[PDB]
């Protein structure tokens, strides 16, 4: 779990739990739910 609370959520990037707690970040700017995070697990791994 590398998604600390350093930041809440980016624009059009909410998040909700599934049948259990699969925190998936919802995307309103693009309309889509994703497992990764739009503010920590995006196109960046340096």
């Amino acid at each position: 779990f590398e998604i600390p609370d350093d930041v809440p959520l980016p624009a059009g990037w909410e998040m909700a739990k599934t049948s259990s707690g699969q925190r998936y970040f919802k995307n309103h700017i693009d309309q889509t739910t994703t497992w990764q995070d739009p503010r920590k697990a995006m196109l960046s791994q340096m």
Partner: peptide, 10 residues
């Protein structure tokens, strides 16, 4: 492994 939810919006 599993696909994301069906998404929603109020």
């Amino acid at each position: 492994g599993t696909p994301p939810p069906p998404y929603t919006v109020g």
